[PDB]
Amino acid sequence: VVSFIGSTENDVGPSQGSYSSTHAMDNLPFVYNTGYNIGYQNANVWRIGGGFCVGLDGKVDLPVVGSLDGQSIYGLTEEVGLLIWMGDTNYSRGTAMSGNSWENVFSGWCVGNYLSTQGLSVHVRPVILKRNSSAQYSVQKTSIGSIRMRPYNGSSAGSVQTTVNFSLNPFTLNDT
Ligand SMILES: CC(=O)N[C@@H]1[C@@H](O)[C@H](O)[C@@H](CO)O[C@H]1O
């Protein structure tokens, strides 16, 4: 048994967020290490039971303005980009992202003959692209991508909602 209990649209990171870094941005691109603060986590998006086996798929829509260490830097504005992560519940369980096609983000599992729940989590890292002349970057609310449950081992979804989508909450990058 499965069931959708979460929400279709989920905002990544809080609104009006301010971030700072005194590290080093000499040789762009630079990537703020804000940990997992800009993201989304709902360990309860699908209710499952009876051997139901589920995995997790993710897909970012933003264009690939490049690639950082085998990961795809996704762009928003001329000067701003991001390192995107998607996967299962525990933020630490994230799977970096490359391209704009559906990729496996969580190997999944097979619950027992009891009632549990299936979750997901997104986390992003703000990348600075092209130079500026104010040392300040704005970020307007923009779509990012989605996650879709992956029923396997003979498991079925049916008409039960399989995908939820994400959106990047606005914010601004500082540095000083
Ligand atoms: C904490 C909880 O009760 N629900 C978790 C769910 O968030 C997670 O997606 C799934 C697979 O790891 O395992 C469930 O037990």
From Swiss-Prot:
It comes from the Bacteria. One of its GO terms (molecular function) is carbohydrate binding. Disulfide bonds join 53-110. One of its GO terms (biological process) is adhesion of symbiont to host. Its main location: other. It is found in: Fimbrium. A carbohydrate binds at residues 43-44, 88-89, 116-119. Residues 1-176 are annotated as: Receptor-binding lectin domain. Keywords: Disulfide bond, Fimbrium, Lectin, Plasmid, Signal, Virulence. GO terms for cellular component: pilus. Essential fimbrial adhesion factor that mediates binding to N-acetylglucosamine-containing receptors in the host intestinal microvilli, leading to colonization of the intestinal tissue, and diarrhea or septicemia. Also confers adhesiveness to laminin and basement membranes. Belongs to the fimbrial protein family. This is F17b-G fimbrial adhesin. The gene is f17bG. The chain holds residues 23 to 198 of 343 of the full protein.
